[PDB]
């Protein structure tokens, strides 16, 4: 019965594709109300090409379905993950969420004030990493494009919305898990570029002004690269409290309740009316009443496009998806801390006690800063060090908020970690190492099979040798900067760089995490970049003496490296390393004549 909100958007699609627009009574949508369907050509594929460069240089890992833009792929993820409704919080829980959100918004806005983002900033982003136009940069250079933005912006000021419709492109696996980089059914969403700017214009200040940064929220890690994250966990462990907990919420984006949207939407109260006049219509029309285009398999070998709507979820493609998820997750963990400390009873979920609203405010006013400082929240990933170990059994308000934990019974006690180095965070754990010179360094680490698996695969077909070589070099230089402590990766990274020409600039996408800042994507010597990253820019390195050679860069212990998937000690690797020059030359022959550098002697 939300037809009025989504009336204009559906009709525009229906009118534009009226020659094929129709109604399909056999649609499988359950939690989405279905409007109509029109025919489209099949877009995308399920072909994941193997990286020949990485393949020949990782022969022992030959023993070691990924990204489905196919219309069959889009429907499968929608049927299993997207098409669901998270239960709304009860009355008592909602007040707790509302009080926490108000306190957090006032806290995160203590020094920063909301502002409107200009098109010049948006033009800066598109130039720095389509139906009529064929390029994003070409569109922003067209005055006709900005007219479409203006007319749609005028509609928002008039209380209307016509073009802010989402596109369900398909699936992109969330994690690289068991092996081969295959885990997670994450849904990727695309939206029109004009709507992207209007969203950026109204809510871009959350990202551009770093509202979720650690110096602002005290619990967020926004803007911190993977190198900085390790020291954060060690610093949290220095604080008093109990064990460290890192619980994943299964389908977090699909479990964003309508109360969560409302609680995040009270930032408009901190904005100027002129700014609110632009942001208020957008949140109501784009987030709170979505219009989504999904391809569905059809009969006679034809593909069809559906138009549907809902009210609650998070689009996962919203420009402030990460920032809003960090805000709500920080609120969720703070609420669970209150239940663990006895402030919130399991019965107060249905109805809060008499004075337990100002008392919650009192607890946040006193313990909010201290509790947040012992948290590390990146989107839906979280690490919390609570006051005591009663936090493990404080599952009532957590499950009431539909933030059900992943791969665990609903009411089974959560288990914490005794050593901060074992705590998972952003698909990584962190090891503490002592260098040859005696200095200590905290490094990110994850199972080696996951790292090799993603490099071996390339998105789509039609890859040239030059393109797939630069992507391989990007993986190799990334390994040297982040995973230098892994013996197999360091040897394999040099092998790629020895096989790939020196002058070639690395390209491609080697990481999906927002914490991958791509310092490895330069042609500068990685040893020089390594000194800048881990010594010069390292706030936890008082002694700024630079490292003079790669041999001074430490490895993990053979016990800790073997535990995390290294193939040292196996006969297969011993042969692989001894004869590593043979695969290097084969790639050089295939590429052709060029200038190269041999990096094996540096090992
Ligand atoms: Zn709109
Ligand atoms: Zn490890």
The rounded Cα 405 to chain-centroid distance in angstroms is 18
CB 33 within 8 A of CB 85: no
Report the C-alpha gap between 315 and 290 in whole angstroms: 8
Please tell me the number of the ligand nearest to residue 289's CA. Answer: 1
Contacts of 222 by beta carbon, 8 Å cutoff, 6+ apart: 210, 211, 212, 213, 214, 322, 323, 326, 378, 514
User: 């297969």: which residue's tokens?
Assistant: 572
d(CA 91, CA 538): 47
Distance (angstroms) between ligand 1 centre and the Cα of 165 equals 8
Q: Measure the CA–CA gap between 417 and 385, rounded to whole angstroms.
A: 10
Short-list 414, 252, 388, CA closest to 327: 252
Q: Are 432 and 234 in contact (CB under 8 A)?
A: yes
Answer left, alpha or beta for residue 245, where phi above 0 means left and psi between -120 and 50 means alpha.
beta
Burial state string for 502-533 with b = 16 or more CB within 10 A and e = fewer than 16: eebebebebbeebbbbbbbbeeeebbebbbeb
CA distances to 54, 110, 132, 587 from 235, rounded to whole Å, are: 37, 24, 52, 45
Cite the annotated binding site by residue number: 152, 156, 161, 164, 429, 431, 445, 564
Q: Please classify residue 257 by burial: count the beta carbons closer than 10 Å to its beta carbon, then call 0-12 exposed, 13-18 middle and 19+ buried.
A: buried
Are 422 and 243 in contact by the 8 Å Cβ rule? The answer is: no
Ligand 2 centroid, distance to 484 Cα (angstroms): 12
Nearest ligand, CA 421: 2
Distance 569 CA to ligand 1 centre (A): 60
Q: What angle do CA 234, 237, 243 make, to 5 degrees?
A: 135
Q: Quote the ligand 1 centre to 155 CA distance (angstroms).
A: 7
**Contact (CB, 8 A) for 599 and 494:** yes
The residue with tokens 């979505």 is 290
Give residue 377 CA to ligand 2 midpoint distance, Å. Answer: 21
Q: Which residues define the annotated binding site for Zn(2+)?
A: 152, 156, 161, 164, 429, 431, 445, 564
Q: Which method was it determined by?
A: X-ray
Q: Kindly identify the ligand whose nearest atom is closest to the C-alpha of 450.
A: 2
In terms of Cα–Cα distance, which of 166, 461, 121 is closest to 315? 166
**Which residues, chain by chain, have CB under 5 Å from ion ligand 2?**
445, 564
Of the ligands numbered here, which is closest to the C-alpha atom of 489? Answer: 2
- Between CA 194 and CA 169 the distance in angstroms is 18
The angle subtended at Cα 34 by Cα 30 and Cα 35, nearest 5°, is 175
- Ligand having the closest approach to the CA of 563: 2
How much distance in Å is there from the Cα of 487 to the middle of ligand 2?
12
Distance from the Cα of residue 493 to its chain's centroid = 25
Written as six digits, the tokens of 559 are 């016990």
Report the C-alpha gap between 276 and 270 in whole angstroms.
9
Whether residue 386 contacts residue 373, with contact meaning beta carbons closer than 8 Å, is answered with no
CA of 149 to the centre of ligand 1 (A): 9
For ligand 2, the distance from its centroid to the CA atom of residue 324, given in whole angstroms, is 31
Residue with tokens 């005055």: 143
Ligand 2 midpoint to CA 70 (Å): 36
**241: exposed, middle or buried (Cβ count in 10 Å: 0-12, 13-18, 19+):** middle
Spatial separation of the C-alpha atoms in residues 246 and 382, rounded to whole Å: 6
Per DSSP, 260 falls in state: H
Contact partners, residue 437, CB within 8 Å, separation at least 6: 545, 552
Burial of 419 (0-12, 13-18, 19+ CB in 10 A): exposed
Classify residue 505 by its DSSP letter. Answer: P
How many angstroms is it from 102 CA to the middle of ligand 1? Answer: 27
Q: What angle do CA 301, 302, 306 make, to 5 degrees?
A: 140
CB half-sphere exposure, 508, CA atoms < 13 A: 26
- Ligand that comes closest to the CA of residue 557: 2
223 within 8 A of 213, measured Cβ to Cβ: yes
The CA distances from residue 154 to 281, 286, 488, in Å, are 11, 15, 57
Q: 371 near 365, Cβ under 8 Å?
A: no
Integer CA distances (angstroms), 365 to 103, 246, 356, 360, in order: 8, 25, 14, 8
The ligand whose atoms approach the alpha carbon of 156 most closely is 1
For 549, phi then psi, to 5°, come to: -155, 160
């Amino acid at each position: 019965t939300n037809w009025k909100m989504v009336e204009d958007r559906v009709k525009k699609l229906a009118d534009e594709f009226s020659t094929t627009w129709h109604y399909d009574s056999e649609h499988p949508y359950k939690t989405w109300n279905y409007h109509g369907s029109y025919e489209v050509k099949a877009t995308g594929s399920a072909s994941s090409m193997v990286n020949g460069v990485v393949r020949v240089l990782s022969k022992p890992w030959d023993t070691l379905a990924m990204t489905d833009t196919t219309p069959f792929g889009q429907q499968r993820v929608f049927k299993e993950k997207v098409d669901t409704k998270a239960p709304e919080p009860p009355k008592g829980t909602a007040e707790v969420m509302r009080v926490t959100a108000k306190w957090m918004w006032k806290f995160v806005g203590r020094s920063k004030t909301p502002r409107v983002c200009t098109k010049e900033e948006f033009i800066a982003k598109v130039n720095s990493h389509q139906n009529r136009w064929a390029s994003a940069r070409e569109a922003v250079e067209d005055p006709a494009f900005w007219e479409m933005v203006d007319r749609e912006r005028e509609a928002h000021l008039q209380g209307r919305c016509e073009m802010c419709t989402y596109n369900m492109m398909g699936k992109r696996e969330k994690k690289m898990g068991e092996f081969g980089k295959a885990k997670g059914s994450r849904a990727i969403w695309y939206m029109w570029l004009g709507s992207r700017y209007l969203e950026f214009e109204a809510l871009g200040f959350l990202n551009e002004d770093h509202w979720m940064s650690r110096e602002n929220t005290l619990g967020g890690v926004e803007g911190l690269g993977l190198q900085k994250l390790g020291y954060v966990l060690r610093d949290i462990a220095k604080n008093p409290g109990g064990l460290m907990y890192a619980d994943d919420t299964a389908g977090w984006d699909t479990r964003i309740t309508k109360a969560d949207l409302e609680n995040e939407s009270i930032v408009l109260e901190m904005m100027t009316p002129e700014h609110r006049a632009l942001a208020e219509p957008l949140i109501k029309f784009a987030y709170m009443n979505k219009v989504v285009k999904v391809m569905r398999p059809g009969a006679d070998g034809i593909t069809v496009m559906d138009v549907i709507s809902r009210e609650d979820q998070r689009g996962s493609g919203q420009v402030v998806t990460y920032a809003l998820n960090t805000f709500t997750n920080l609120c969720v963990q703070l609420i669970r801390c209150m239940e663990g400390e006895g402030l919130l009873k399991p019965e107060e979920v249905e109805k809060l006690e008499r004075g337990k609203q100002r008392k919650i405010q009192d607890w946040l006013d006193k313990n909010g800063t201290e509790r947040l400082a012992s948290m590390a929240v990146s989107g839906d990933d979280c690490v919390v060090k609570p006051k005591d170990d009663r936090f493990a059994t404080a599952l009532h308000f957590l499950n009431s908020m539909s933030k059900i934990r992943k791969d665990i019974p609903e009411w089974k006690q959560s288990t914490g970690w005794r050593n901060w180095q074992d705590v998972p965070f952003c698909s990584h754990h962190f090891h503490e190492l002592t260098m040859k010179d005696g200095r200590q360094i905290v490094v990110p680490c994850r199972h080696q099979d996951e790292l090799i698996g993603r490099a071996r695969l390339s998105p789509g077909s039609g890859w040239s040798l030059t393109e797939t070589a630069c992507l391989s070099k990007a993986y190799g230089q990334m390994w040297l900067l982040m995973y230098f402590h892994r013996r197999d990766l360091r040897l394999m990274a040099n092998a790629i760089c020895s096989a790939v020409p020196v002058s070639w600039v690395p390209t491609g996408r080697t990481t999906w995490s927002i914490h991958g800042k791509g310092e490895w994507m330069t042609t500068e010597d990685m040893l020089r970049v390594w000194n800048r990253v881990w010594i010069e820019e390292n706030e936890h390195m008082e002694d700024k003496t630079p490292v003079s050679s790669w041999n001074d860069v430490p490895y993990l212990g053979k016990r800790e490296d073997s535990w995390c998937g290294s193939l040292i000690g196996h006969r297969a690797r011993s042969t692989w390393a001894e004869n590593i020059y043979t695969p290097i030359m084969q790639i050089r022959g295939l590429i052709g004549p060029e200038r190269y550098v041999d990096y094996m002697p540096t090992l």
